Amino acid sequence: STSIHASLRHLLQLGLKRSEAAIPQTITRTAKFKINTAIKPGLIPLLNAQFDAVEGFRRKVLGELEAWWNEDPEAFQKMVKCSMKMKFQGKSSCYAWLYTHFLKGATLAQGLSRDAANSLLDNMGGGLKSFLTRRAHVAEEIRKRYDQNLGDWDDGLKDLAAEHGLELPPPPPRVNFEKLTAQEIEKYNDWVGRTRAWGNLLLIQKKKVERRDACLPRYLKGYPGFPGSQRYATASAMAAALAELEQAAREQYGKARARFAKVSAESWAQTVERFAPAPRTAHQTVSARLAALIAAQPGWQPAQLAEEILAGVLRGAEKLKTHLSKCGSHDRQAVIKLANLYNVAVAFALEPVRVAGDYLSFYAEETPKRKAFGNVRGALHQPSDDTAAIQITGFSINDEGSPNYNGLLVCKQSGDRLHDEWAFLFCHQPGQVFQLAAEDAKLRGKILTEWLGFGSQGGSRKKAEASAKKMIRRPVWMNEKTPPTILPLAFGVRQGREYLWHFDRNLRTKEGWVLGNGRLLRVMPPGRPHAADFYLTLTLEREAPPLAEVAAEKYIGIARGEAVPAAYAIIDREGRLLAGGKIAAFRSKERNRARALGGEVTRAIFALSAAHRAPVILANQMQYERMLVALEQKFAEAGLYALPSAPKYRKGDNGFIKLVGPAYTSATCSACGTMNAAEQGALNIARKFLFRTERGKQAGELTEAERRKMRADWQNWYKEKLR
DNA sequence: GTTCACCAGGGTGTCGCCCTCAAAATCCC
DNA sequence: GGGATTTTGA
């Protein structure tokens, strides 16, 4: 065994006791199957049509809500967080008002299934709410930072500015933190940047504070972007980017005719100094070749040879030929060499202005080129996938078996229970219906089918009903002339025997898993709909076993180490260590050393816990916290540690995951505030749990922020704990 | 010969903050 | 007249 499944198996077969404080839990889990478009490739056009029709609605409502957000942000905040008591326009929580305003008595785009729009607006409210409740905390924090700045800038920390010249930059803008906007935060962060750049520019007055601790008006950061703002941003293609870059470069080439011949006495000396000889870059190429060899013998009148060097830099017309003519914009090499040529054309074209030390006209002239080069370099990268999801709000069936929404899971089951189908019925065209009736039912307008559907009933989250959700396995009667789409599905045995045919939660033969909601996911490379992957994401729920009275006779202390990942030590209820031991660009950097190690140590932690039955003493780092989350999930899924709402409410003594903050000790026979490796560290972390048991303090709150009156306490305790 | 400030544009991750609808009541030809 | 739509919740 020794495996996470086979160790959770032992943890379930752990007849400790049934704690009377056992609050019922629920285990939410998801089965992510793949529609088998390979077998049924005719879906791909249909599924993609539905998906791109629902993005049209998604963006329409999102943009409308953003326009209304900046127009009436107070009324918008009233709308989002409605309720049965505080209604907006006499409507309950967001979804009611969304349907009323957007999909009530409103025609839908051709090919859009108003069930898909209903689920869209159903799921919109939980994004608007997150936006609001993150903006609140942000606003508070950025108010703090603004307070700090305004209180130590232009008022309080002008002694340093008084020590030298440069009285004061422009004054900071006023930000109405009563109602702060993205625009106001933008124009304040702009001034923060201006003043930071001014401080770095005035580095001659001993203002080396870029990393030295002084001055530096901090930024206002963290303000959320209204939902959809950064999702469906227009972005930019390549051809447009290169066209705007070439327009800016040609502008500079044309206007550079005589800007050189304005002073050309010491300006040209600096021009030649900047672009002088050093895979040759565009800068290196032009500098080392064209000015170097066009100046000496030929082409006098520096103005005239400036035109010739710019003609050379702009001889990259052949690259424009390779792109526009035969071959496309998919050759990154040509695109990067053309963009570099344009950038250097501009950079050496504005050189006389740069030498003049304007930096204000120069910035204005290089803004078009700057933006164009940014949009070329940003369009050059595309390792991303466009993901759109359609959600079935639920899988419920009325008294007659007719569903309330547009999705169902079906099984064309065989006699031997070895050749079952497990497809998904989706309803999106007009006339697509199905019923969960009996084989002996006589339904009008519907024809039986070999499919067996898994509906649900109950769980209505209303005081009146407040039932317990229960599935319903009943044969599927489909419309003869208009059958709902069948999404062949594709999974593994390890995956279906977890959710579909589980020894104890077999969908068709045993009570267990409960249907939650669903999502049809499209995951396609941008602009490549025929390569789109499709998934069905079914959320199932369980009731976890009740907690157990952990009268542990042994404990498993576990601590991190260098020679060891997470060395472990098995003690009893009175310490006196019983046993000890050791546990355990993109590939090696992240995967090999994050996942393959965290997972192995986690299953080793379960192996130790279950084998010795002993609860885990674990400290209060991303791969440590992922191991902690996995242990929490798979102990809560055992009649053990009770998962807390949000990871803030860690009880510190919560079943088998008994959390103790520091160790801050040693085993030199006199403690601290050498022997073997972190094995003794885990010994002392377990003993420290035992000590804090007598002490009776909340180790979770102020795990390390407090040191006074604590460091000496454990120091003395271990200095005396030798009897 | 890199390291900081600011500016333009992307990419990769993790973290906030939210969610995992059933059941009527009402127009339909 | 079942299919589609609408409102609703602590």
Next chain:
RNA sequence: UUAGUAUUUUCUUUGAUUCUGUACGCCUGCCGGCCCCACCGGAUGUGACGUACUUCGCGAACGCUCGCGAAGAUGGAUUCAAAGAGGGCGACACCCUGGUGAAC
């Protein structure tokens, strides 16, 4: 493979071992003459498009014969080993590419 006597599928991944690793045409990129182009040339040994060949999935006639779509140095195959609960939106943290600035 990663279930307990014992369950079906083909999913998304992650380690470790051994094998298999496509042709031409033209453009393009690197270098020299040359100084950007253009013509010359080297290696082309970095992109790209066009056409072929290998494999795969769906269809049409008799293991062959044809029509579409996918991939072909981040590929494919073997033998072990093992996770997975998903979605949404947005922010941060870091990195790459360019530019200006002075400081060292």
